[PDB]
Amino acid sequence: ENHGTEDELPNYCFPLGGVINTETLTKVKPGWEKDATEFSDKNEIRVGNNFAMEINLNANLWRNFLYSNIALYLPDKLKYSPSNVKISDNPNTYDYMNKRVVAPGLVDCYINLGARWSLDYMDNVNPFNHHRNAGLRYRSMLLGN
Amino acid sequence: DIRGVLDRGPTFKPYSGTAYNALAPKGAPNPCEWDETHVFGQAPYSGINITKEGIQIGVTPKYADKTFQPEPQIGESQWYETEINHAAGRVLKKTTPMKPCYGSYAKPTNENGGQGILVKLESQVEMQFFSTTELTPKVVLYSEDVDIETPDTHISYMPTIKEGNSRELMGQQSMPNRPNYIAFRDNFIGLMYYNSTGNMGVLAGQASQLNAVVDLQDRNTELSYQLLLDSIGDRTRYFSMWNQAVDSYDPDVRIIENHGTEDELPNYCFPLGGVINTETLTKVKPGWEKDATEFSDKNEIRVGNNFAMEINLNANLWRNFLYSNIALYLPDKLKYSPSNVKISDNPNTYDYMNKRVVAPGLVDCYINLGARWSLDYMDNVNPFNHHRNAGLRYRSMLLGNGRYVPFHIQVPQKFFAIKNLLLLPGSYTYEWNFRKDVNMVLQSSLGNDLRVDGASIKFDSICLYATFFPMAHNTASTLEAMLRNDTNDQSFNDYLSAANMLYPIPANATNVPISIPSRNWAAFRGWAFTRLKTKETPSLGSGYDPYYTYSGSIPYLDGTFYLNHTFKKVAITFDSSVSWPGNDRLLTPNEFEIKRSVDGEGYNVAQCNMTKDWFLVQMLANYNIGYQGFYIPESYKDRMYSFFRNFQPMS
Amino acid sequence: GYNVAQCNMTKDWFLVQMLANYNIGYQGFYIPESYKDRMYSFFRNFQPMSRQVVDDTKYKDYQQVGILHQHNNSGFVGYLAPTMREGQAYPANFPYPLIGKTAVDSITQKKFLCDRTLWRIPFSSNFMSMGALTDLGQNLLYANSAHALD
Amino acid sequence: KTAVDSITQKKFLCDRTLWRIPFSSNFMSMGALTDLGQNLLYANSAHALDMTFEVDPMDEPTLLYVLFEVFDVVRVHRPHRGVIETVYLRTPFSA
Amino acid sequence: ENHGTEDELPNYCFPLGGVINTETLTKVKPGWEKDATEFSDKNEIRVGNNFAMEINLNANLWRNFLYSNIALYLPDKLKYSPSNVKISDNPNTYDYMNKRVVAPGLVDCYINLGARWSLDYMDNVNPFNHHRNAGLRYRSMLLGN
Amino acid sequence: YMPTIKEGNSRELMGQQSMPNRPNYIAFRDNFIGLMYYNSTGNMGVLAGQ
């Protein structure tokens, strides 16, 4: 039910000390004259806003959910073998099904936006062979870890 | 109907995290000064010109009001820097406490929002000018002093002991105080005296003055009321008018289903302008030649990818959830006192229970990974004394969010002998007693002693309400006359209908024998037992307990038992010579074996250590299931307090 | 003295509503059966709430401040608009604390919400639902003559 | 591939409940007044009962809560106006 | 039911390579003497902790939820027109209701903290004219996107 | 946030910021309420023998 994400506000990261790029200024007094026997010549002053970077959160959470629960269960005909690594030739081996790489662009945060519509590839595969099967997960944890 | 005024004390804090400067980094300090004299600050505001009268904000020139300007929210608006030529800001004088920005609050002192301190009553802000190292000033700092407080946060790491604002004091960090809800107990348990001879409640005819209510020391009523309420209704709903909100807990915190996190993709954060480290290049044209009358010599071009850093989001969310809901509730023997800070010696004081520090490594995002397994330390502590108890949280929010709450509540009658009595015309004397100990009538989410934390309560007015059915007089006379026949006497029975015996168990003891002297056993119905902590149980029938210093949930009253999983064997015999039930009914023909170790795996069941015979007995006792194959009972037959509902196998 | 359910609803009105919907109240209030209180019933959508606010009359140091001057998370949140962050770090000046050692004197406000429902006033002697054709409807007083209602 | 040899641990949790041991021949709930309670063996004479529990220990004093559920019945009679009298009976363990 | 957020631990962000600002040092051996025919003079060593900043996550998620679901549905008397942009005069058009700006400070992560209390303004606005109305959302996706 | 009102690509125009438009679902009413005329004398529905 891809109804998008709520990302009206921007979220930021700020340095541990708050400011990291500050200049050193000297104190002067009234025509203006220098000062001594007071505040030292080494004063950490930051002009303007503090340095910070921004990351969208709801969009990132949506992307992680989609890739981990759908994009990894596409039919093998859509995936492709990786490069410079070994991979088992038998398609039923766990090694084969684990090392096949899927382009995230196939299913992203904008696929069929605003529509309640399962994928045209996902409907011909077993949905119960999924790691979110609560019954299967519960039975597995019953034996142990 | 009771009306009064309540004071919940300074311990009350009905929310996690803080309220002031929540988004701030936990180590970021407010701009301030100190002596060794050095100043550390930041001026965001931009003006036009700087003179001896301060920054000029507009027009003849106008200068900022030192009382409240420059405001600390106004700053720039474009991400790219523009080489501000005249800046202003605010700093704190050296005569103020040195605190981090996170959680720091200072009350205002004027309608414009200023926070300066007024003395004889005018403020005393000062002007400070700073210029580059080689003549006009460049920035102006508005130094002042405020009554800065930390209402809900405490220092988590104090670098040194020496008091006073010094350079080393910049490194302190703070984290919010633990949440602690305080409210009335479920169904107003404890406000009404029960099963106490000294505080006997009386209901008698006006003329006879002979008490019609006689209670017993061993009889339990509030627990009986709780069980009765569950059987005849549903407890998952909330009724505010009776303060009806059953205590519970999140199934996740009690039993962690740690199946890891989904973090296949990397999540990144990017600079505000997209690129920050870019070089300047000139434009050339075809052998190549320079160009003029065109694109300037200064062009911002960035080669390669843009600067960025990454976060594992799901892992971080998992860590925060675990530490805040589990690691803070470990037994105190695992924690350790912090350093360079004061802490109350009393283990029951909220200050002590708040300042003890827990290493996050004890419970991290990798503990028992892939297994549905509760911790070996969490299972011996009360799970209902947790800030996620929805019933407790709902009741706390009913009163309000302040510490001084005038309340007005309604209390029902719980004694089984009169709670359904149908009276007849006449005059009767109705008299009862009510408690005042805050440790009993109130309930906290941490169980800290409230007698020492200053919580108080005072009742002003008490009134009794009763509603009569507007029913016809003629048939009322017939009904009351017909009810005055000895053959039609009303009768009631207690729902629990049990005699309660408490037997001490010494610490670290394993075997506890009890004995009952010879007596008639006609009409006996059976046993029902559990285990309680003497720390969490008040004395029976005492008017006031001077040694009861626990304000958490009381399993003996509200029926929230959590120690049933600590039984191994039960042996029952009459006359000390004939065993019961005998007749080799069970696999062990002498005793009930609740659970065994791996040695007796041949008798385990349900993929646990609980033996088959005990499991069969419990199923038969609750739903009469087992003689024709086990299966899940009907949902309407296993209520909230039933056995099969709360049975959880783990490995 | 006449409120109920820890809100500002009067006792008599609350009793009438319970009687009108589920005939509950003459033998003690309790949770009605789930099948009896449907999605539009009164009790399903009854929500009593309360809160405390700073007593501007008793607090000696009260200073009413406007929206244009409250600074919380200053230097980390845009000013009066969902835009880029600006400003500088500074101790907050809003809202007034209501807990802890330095809590201020406060008053209380109580109110309630009730959606997807209609206030019902049955035309019966005891406000009970003993049939579609109520007893007062069959009373001869209104059966013969006419009356003007305001 | 590099997993290490391991042992297993099993346990269980049971909250908000009491261990129940009915005093009936087949542990069935066939009525409030159980058959064994009506047996003549316990109806005529008296018996001294002792019973031992074996529990795993912890490091703080604890209490063993035992409930001998019995019949607790009160009958209320009033002959005239404004006079109320009651009778109590808790059998066994009567005061 | 504003019961605050759980933010006891700080959540950080780290550079892609782990370290960015490292020095170049030479290897010496025992008095001490320089070395050759071994580790080159160009060695990337970082002293002290790695550079990183941090984010409060639960607080940010709470703010986004509040602004997107409440602050945008305040009565128009509390909002104010933006600047330097064109906005339709008719108060019923989508353009008008989309371009009015609301100061986030009206409803922030600290409004009525710890109290289960609806706002004094939302009690007079229709709660069913909300984008989280499941019935309305379901019927919309039924037609299509 | 528009920095300046003057049109044309200028340096000051770097600083504009965007936020998504408010969501607005449009669909038929529940149970197709309002599609058929009810309780209107002018648009009276009729069902009669032939």
Side-chain angles (χ1 to χ4, degrees), chain A residues 1-41 43-145, chain B residues 1-80 82 84-110 112-120 123-125 127-135 137-161 164-297 299-651, chain C residues 1-59 61-150, chain D, chain E residues 1-41 43-145, chain F residues 1-5 8-50:
Chain A
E1 192 240 351
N2 187 15
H3 52 216
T5 91
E6 309 159 343
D7 48 324
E8 281 76 3
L9 299 198
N11 318 138
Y12 299 91
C13 40
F14 304 92
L16 284 186
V19 290
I20 50 66
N21 41 358
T22 87
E23 310 65 342
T24 83
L25 310 177
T26 167
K27 175 155 155 58
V28 287
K29 75 163 169 302
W32 307 84
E33 303 94 67
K34 214 198 108 56
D35 285 83
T37 75
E38 271 316 309
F39 307 80
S40 96
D41 50 77
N43 313 318
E44 293 72 62
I45 317 295
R46 159 68 176 163
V47 287
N49 293 322
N50 48 0
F51 174 80
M53 329 150 69
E54 148 196 348
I55 156 191
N56 193 313
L57 288 189
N58 303 87
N60 271 278
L61 293 195
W62 193 235
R63 278 192 81 243
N64 271 111
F65 171 82
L66 283 189
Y67 188 88
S68 147
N69 303 271
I70 292 189
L72 289 183
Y73 293 80
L74 294 175
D76 186 76
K77 57 186 181 65
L78 297 194
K79 326 187 169 192
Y80 67 98
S81 146
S83 323
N84 322 98
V85 316
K86 309 296 304 314
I87 175 168
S88 76
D89 37 356
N90 178 21
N92 302 339
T93 322
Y94 173 73
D95 203 350
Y96 178 84
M97 296 185 354
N98 187 30
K99 298 215 170 186
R100 296 282 283 188
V101 61
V102 179
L106 285 185
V107 174
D108 208 337
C109 45
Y110 49 74
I111 176 64
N112 295 322
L113 197 38
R116 179 169 178 274
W117 165 274
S118 69
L119 296 180
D120 270 4
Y121 304 123
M122 276 342 296
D123 37 3
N124 284 15
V125 301
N126 194 314
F128 302 89
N129 302 337
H130 193 276
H131 81 272
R132 272 183 180 263
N133 181 9
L136 177 56
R137 188 166 59 198
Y138 176 84
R139 281 181 276 128
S140 148
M141 288 160 161
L142 215 30
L143 295 184
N145 63 335
Chain B
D1 177 89
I2 313 185
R3 312 160 64 184
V5 53
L6 212 161
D7 179 19
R8 303 201 243 195
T11 304
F12 183 66
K13 175 181 185 291
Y15 58 92
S16 44
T18 184
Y20 315 90
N21 293 335
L23 302 190
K26 293 181 174 50
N30 310 270
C32 47
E33 318 169 341
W34 73 101
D35 297 346
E36 296 176 13
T37 291
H38 302 67
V39 56
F40 163 80
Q42 155 212 17
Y45 189 78
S46 149
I48 324 170
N49 187 16
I50 294 177
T51 78
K52 64 180 175 183
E53 292 187 4
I55 190 54
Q56 167 186 351
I57 56 182
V59 170
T60 169
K62 193 176 59 176
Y63 294 85
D65 183 22
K66 68 182 212 164
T67 72
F68 78 108
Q69 289 163 333
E71 309 216 33
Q73 322 88 300
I74 310 174
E76 286 319 298
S77 30
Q78 57 279 69
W79 52 272
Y80 63 101
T82 40
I84 309 304
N85 298 335
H86 303 80
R90 320 193 65 84
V91 292
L92 267 39
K93 281 181 180 178
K94 58 185 174 183
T95 90
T96 55
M98 254 288 194
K99 298 283 190 174
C101 155
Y102 183 98
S104 44
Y105 157 80
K107 75 167 68 62
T109 56
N110 52 64
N112 281 333
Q115 298 175 286
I117 276 305
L118 306 171
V119 315
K120 189 55 178 181
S123 156
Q124 308 304 314
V125 307
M127 278 315 72
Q128 298 172 18
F129 303 92
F130 294 107
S131 146
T132 59
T133 74
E134 311 320 292
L135 175 59
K138 186 182 180 183
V139 316
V140 202
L141 288 192
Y142 282 66
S143 56
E144 50 171 319
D145 49 310
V146 310
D147 36 35
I148 166 177
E149 322 159 16
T150 71
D152 52 357
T153 78
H154 67 267
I155 295 296
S156 38
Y157 162 66
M158 176 96 39
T160 188
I161 270 294
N165 303 356
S166 97
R167 157 179 290 278
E168 316 89 293
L169 210 53
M170 284 321 189
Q172 48 210 19
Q173 310 168 26
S174 68
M175 57 145 200
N177 297 336
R178 293 184 51 177
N180 178 24
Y181 300 95
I182 284 187
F184 286 107
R185 298 201 178 279
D186 177 283
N187 285 144
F188 297 115
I189 279 172
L191 279 91
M192 276 225 68
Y193 259 106
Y194 286 122
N195 326 289
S196 292
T197 61
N199 302 55
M200 191 64 287
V202 67
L203 159 69
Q206 197 40 66
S208 105
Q209 273 297 333
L210 182 272
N211 197 348
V213 166
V214 277
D215 207 332
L216 289 189
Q217 240 284 2
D218 49 356
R219 182 193 274 111
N220 186 306
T221 63
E222 69 310 356
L223 177 50
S224 151
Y225 186 78
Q226 288 276 318
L227 299 197
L228 186 269
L229 188 42
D230 186 11
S231 95
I232 68 102
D234 164 43
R235 296 308 307 277
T236 66
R237 312 197 63 193
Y238 295 147
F239 195 19
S240 90
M241 195 231 63
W242 292 130
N243 224 42
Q244 191 161 308
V246 58
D247 325 82
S248 65
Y249 53 87
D250 196 9
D252 316 353
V253 292
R254 180 57 155 169
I255 299 176
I256 51 196
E257 197 246 354
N258 186 15
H259 53 214
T261 91
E262 311 158 344
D263 47 324
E264 282 76 2
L265 300 200
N267 319 136
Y268 296 93
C269 41
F270 302 93
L272 278 202
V275 291
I276 51 77
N277 40 358
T278 173
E279 45 287 56
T280 167
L281 304 175
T282 88
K283 175 155 154 58
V284 289
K285 73 163 169 302
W288 309 84
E289 303 93 66
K290 215 197 108 57
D291 284 84
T293 74
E294 271 316 308
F295 304 77
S296 96
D297 51 77
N299 319 317
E300 293 72 61
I301 316 296
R302 159 69 175 163
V303 290
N305 290 323
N306 48 0
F307 177 82
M309 338 190 205
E310 83 158 315
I311 291 204
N312 196 314
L313 283 186
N314 303 88
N316 272 279
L317 293 196
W318 194 236
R319 277 192 82 242
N320 272 112
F321 172 82
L322 283 188
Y323 188 88
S324 147
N325 302 270
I326 294 188
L328 292 182
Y329 294 81
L330 293 177
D332 185 76
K333 58 186 181 65
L334 297 194
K335 328 190 168 192
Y336 67 99
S337 146
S339 324
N340 318 280
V341 318
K342 267 76 48 161
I343 176 168
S344 75
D345 37 356
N346 180 20
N348 303 338
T349 290
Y350 169 74
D351 202 350
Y352 175 84
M353 268 181 5
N354 186 30
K355 299 214 171 185
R356 296 282 284 190
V357 62
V358 166
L362 285 185
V363 171
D364 208 337
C365 45
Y366 49 74
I367 177 64
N368 294 321
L369 198 38
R372 178 168 179 274
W373 168 271
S374 100
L375 296 179
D376 269 5
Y377 303 123
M378 282 342 305
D379 36 3
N380 282 16
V381 301
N382 195 314
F384 302 89
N385 302 337
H386 191 276
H387 82 272
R388 272 183 181 263
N389 182 9
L392 178 55
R393 189 166 60 198
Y394 176 84
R395 282 181 276 129
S396 146
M397 269 145 175
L398 228 40
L399 297 184
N401 62 337
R403 82 164 275 185
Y404 307 112
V405 187
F407 65 97
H408 168 211
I409 66 187
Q410 298 83 355
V411 174
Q413 168 56 264
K414 286 174 180 173
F415 202 68
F416 84 109
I418 62 181
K419 91 189 198 65
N420 280 103
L421 198 293
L422 180 57
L423 263 180
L424 290 188
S427 50
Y428 314 92
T429 292
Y430 200 5
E431 184 168 17
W432 217 280
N433 304 84
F434 304 90
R435 285 203 184 85
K436 285 184 175 180
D437 171 29
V438 300
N439 258 341
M440 197 97 42
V441 316
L442 289 184
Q443 159 183 355
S444 100
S445 100
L446 306 186
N448 60 319
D449 194 352
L450 296 181
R451 296 175 185 176
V452 200
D453 285 336
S456 90
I457 176 180
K458 185 179 55 54
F459 315 92
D460 307 1
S461 101
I462 169 60
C463 318
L464 172 61
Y465 283 90
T467 86
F468 301 87
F469 194 91
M471 80 139 266
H473 285 186
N474 54 345
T475 78
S477 55
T478 69
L479 168 64
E480 75 95 40
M482 183 180 344
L483 264 190
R484 286 203 199 277
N485 280 344
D486 55 340
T487 163
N488 304 342
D489 297 340
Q490 314 184 51
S491 54
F492 312 90
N493 71 320
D494 199 334
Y495 177 73
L496 183 55
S497 92
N500 311 274
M501 302 330 252
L502 295 171
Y503 294 104
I505 288 180
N508 311 120
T510 70
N511 184 6
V512 52
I514 68 180
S515 40
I516 282 86
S518 191
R519 75 166 63 242
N520 171 257
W521 292 98
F524 184 49
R525 302 208 291 117
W527 301 264
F529 57 89
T530 179
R531 198 177 188 178
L532 316 172
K533 297 182 176 187
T534 185
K535 142 96 163 182
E536 307 166 347
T537 284
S539 48
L540 265 278
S542 147
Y544 181 84
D545 192 298
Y547 302 142
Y548 184 73
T549 61
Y550 164 80
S551 65
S553 147
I554 315 174
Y556 178 57
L557 312 187
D558 50 38
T560 67
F561 311 92
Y562 60 100
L563 291 189
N564 306 347
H565 68 269
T566 58
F567 279 91
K568 287 210 202 72
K569 291 178 170 184
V570 170
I572 302 164
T573 186
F574 291 110
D575 302 316
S576 74
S577 64
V578 36
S579 152
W580 193 92
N583 300 333
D584 56 271
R585 285 288 193 271
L586 314 177
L587 304 180
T588 86
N590 33 339
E591 54 174 344
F592 296 79
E593 204 167 18
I594 290 94
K595 64 177 185 182
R596 317 154 61 107
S597 98
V598 188
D599 46 359
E601 181 62 31
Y603 290 155
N604 295 15
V605 82
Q607 322 213 48
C608 279
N609 56 344
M610 160 185 324
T611 82
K612 296 189 178 55
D613 38 4
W614 184 254
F615 185 85
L616 165 67
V617 157
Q618 291 314 300
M619 281 306 219
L620 288 182
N622 286 270
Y623 333 102
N624 321 300
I625 304 297
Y627 276 123
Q628 300 191 222
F630 306 96
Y631 53 88
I632 298 180
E634 225 297 328
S635 84
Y636 93 103
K637 273 173 58 181
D638 53 338
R639 324 221 54 87
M640 143 87 66
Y641 291 149
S642 160
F643 157 69
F644 180 71
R645 176 90 58 184
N646 318 111
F647 172 74
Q648 295 289 332
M650 314 174 312
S651 318
Chain C
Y2 289 155
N3 296 15
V4 83
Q6 321 213 47
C7 96
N8 59 343
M9 173 153 336
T10 80
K11 295 188 177 56
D12 39 5
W13 183 254
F14 184 85
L15 165 67
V16 157
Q17 291 314 300
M18 298 298 283
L19 286 182
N21 288 270
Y22 334 102
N23 325 298
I24 304 297
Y26 278 122
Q27 300 193 221
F29 311 95
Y30 51 86
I31 295 297
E33 222 297 332
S34 87
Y35 89 86
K36 272 170 57 180
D37 56 337
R38 324 219 56 87
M39 98 154 293
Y40 288 154
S41 319
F42 155 70
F43 187 75
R44 175 90 60 185
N45 321 110
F46 179 74
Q47 296 290 333
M49 341 168 288
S50 319
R51 73 160 184 171
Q52 282 91 18
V53 310
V54 40
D55 193 337
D56 46 358
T57 84
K58 295 190 51 184
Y59 190 38
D61 320 332
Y62 177 76
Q63 282 285 338
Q64 172 224 4
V65 83
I67 176 63
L68 308 188
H69 306 270
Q70 313 178 4
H71 52 72
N72 201 328
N73 308 265
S74 99
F76 303 126
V77 165
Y79 181 54
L80 307 187
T83 72
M84 86 187 336
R85 56 94 201 74
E86 51 163 310
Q88 64 163 146
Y90 216 69
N93 68 328
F94 188 88
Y96 286 96
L98 302 181
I99 63 181
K101 156 69 209 70
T102 61
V104 302
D105 35 350
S106 58
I107 62 185
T108 59
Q109 301 175 346
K110 300 175 178 297
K111 71 172 177 176
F112 71 101
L113 295 186
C114 214
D115 324 333
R116 319 161 111 168
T117 172
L118 310 170
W119 297 126
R120 299 181 171 277
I121 303 182
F123 195 52
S124 95
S125 58
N126 61 346
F127 315 112
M128 284 234 302
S129 49
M130 298 138 33
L133 184 45
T134 193
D135 38 0
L136 279 182
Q138 319 159 231
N139 198 281
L140 81 179
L141 160 68
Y142 314 113
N144 50 29
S145 153
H147 299 275
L149 161 66
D150 37 16
Chain D
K1 155 70 211 69
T2 61
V4 299
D5 37 332
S6 34
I7 61 185
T8 60
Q9 300 177 346
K10 303 173 177 297
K11 71 175 177 179
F12 70 101
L13 296 187
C14 212
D15 320 347
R16 319 165 110 171
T17 171
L18 312 170
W19 296 127
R20 298 182 169 277
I21 300 181
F23 194 52
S24 67
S25 55
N26 62 346
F27 315 112
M28 278 261 261
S29 50
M30 278 135 42
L33 185 45
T34 194
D35 38 0
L36 279 183
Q38 319 160 235
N39 198 282
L40 80 178
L41 160 68
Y42 314 114
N44 50 29
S45 64
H47 296 275
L49 159 69
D50 49 12
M51 47 187 279
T52 91
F53 293 78
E54 188 292 1
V55 313
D56 36 2
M58 50 225 101
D59 43 5
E60 66 224 53
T62 48
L63 290 188
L64 175 62
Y65 191 20
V66 179
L67 287 87
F68 310 87
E69 68 265 5
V70 301
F71 278 98
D72 213 1
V73 152
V74 59
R75 167 154 169 153
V76 175
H77 159 59
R78 77 273 301 299
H80 305 85
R81 185 183 197 279
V83 41
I84 164 160
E85 71 101 12
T86 84
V87 284
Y88 285 68
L89 184 53
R90 195 186 62 162
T91 167
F93 294 84
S94 38
Chain E
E1 197 247 352
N2 186 16
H3 52 217
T5 88
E6 309 157 343
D7 46 324
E8 282 76 2
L9 302 198
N11 320 135
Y12 296 86
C13 34
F14 302 93
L16 283 190
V19 291
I20 60 104
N21 36 356
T22 87
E23 280 77 4
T24 57
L25 311 177
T26 166
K27 174 156 155 58
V28 287
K29 75 163 168 302
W32 306 85
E33 303 95 67
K34 214 197 108 56
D35 285 83
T37 74
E38 271 316 309
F39 306 78
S40 97
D41 50 76
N43 316 136
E44 299 75 64
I45 316 295
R46 159 68 175 163
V47 287
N49 289 321
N50 49 359
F51 170 78
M53 62 261 282
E54 61 100 347
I55 296 205
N56 196 315
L57 285 188
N58 303 88
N60 270 278
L61 293 196
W62 191 236
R63 279 191 80 244
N64 275 113
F65 173 83
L66 283 189
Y67 187 88
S68 148
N69 305 272
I70 293 189
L72 289 184
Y73 293 80
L74 296 175
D76 186 78
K77 57 186 180 64
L78 297 194
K79 324 188 170 192
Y80 68 99
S81 146
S83 324
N84 320 98
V85 318
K86 190 42 196 53
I87 176 167
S88 72
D89 38 357
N90 179 20
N92 306 343
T93 88
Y94 176 70
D95 205 350
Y96 180 83
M97 314 177 12
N98 189 30
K99 298 216 169 187
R100 298 283 284 187
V101 62
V102 182
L106 286 185
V107 198
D108 207 336
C109 46
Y110 49 74
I111 175 63
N112 296 321
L113 198 38
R116 177 169 179 276
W117 166 272
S118 68
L119 293 181
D120 266 4
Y121 303 124
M122 289 327 75
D123 39 354
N124 283 17
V125 299
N126 194 314
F128 301 86
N129 303 337
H130 195 277
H131 79 272
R132 270 183 180 263
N133 181 10
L136 177 55
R137 190 167 60 197
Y138 177 84
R139 281 180 277 128
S140 149
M141 292 161 180
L142 205 30
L143 293 185
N145 64 335
Chain F
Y1 159 67
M2 182 91 24
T4 188
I5 177 154
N9 301 357
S10 97
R11 157 179 291 279
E12 316 88 292
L13 213 51
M14 272 327 138
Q16 47 211 18
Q17 307 171 27
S18 280
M19 44 150 198
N21 296 336
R22 294 186 51 177
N24 178 24
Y25 301 95
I26 284 187
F28 287 107
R29 300 200 177 279
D30 178 284
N31 284 143
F32 298 116
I33 277 172
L35 260 178
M36 317 192 21
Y37 264 101
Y38 278 122
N39 319 288
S40 147
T41 57
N43 301 55
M44 185 61 125
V46 63
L47 159 70
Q50 197 40 66

